[PDB]
Amino acid sequence: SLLEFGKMILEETGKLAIPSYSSYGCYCGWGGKGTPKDATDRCCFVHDCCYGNLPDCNPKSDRYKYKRVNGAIVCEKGTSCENRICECDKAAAICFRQNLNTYSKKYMLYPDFLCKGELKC
């Protein structure tokens, strides 16, 4: 759920999910349209697609367990949905960390009309 995801992001990047990643670019936030603005926005695009492969699950509210094994994120065994949700989030946290160097404040609170184009999962 958003509770585990936010904790994961904070630990990984040092940034608070809200408002660092909740209204960033075209995909980090509600829905998404157009072409991702940068690497960080691409992370959210892929994350959005990852959740999209889980029709019957509820990523926003289903809680999973995870632990750190010397920095590494390890998803604990739970329900099938919980395991898959955790893997989606873990990937996003790592992706955000790998692209922290290009994170740009000009993409915070990005205007909707500037999101134009198409990109399929």
Ligand SMILES: CC1(C)Cc2c(-c3ccccc3)c(-c3ccc(Cl)cc3)c(CC(=O)O)n2C1
């Ligand atoms: C789909 C959203 C646009 C709606 C939403 C909430 C949200 C919260 C409450 C009620 C409605 C929506 C939170 C969110 C919430 C709380 C924390 Cl601690 C972190 C992130 C996040 C960031 C994320 O995890 O992707 N989002 C993205």
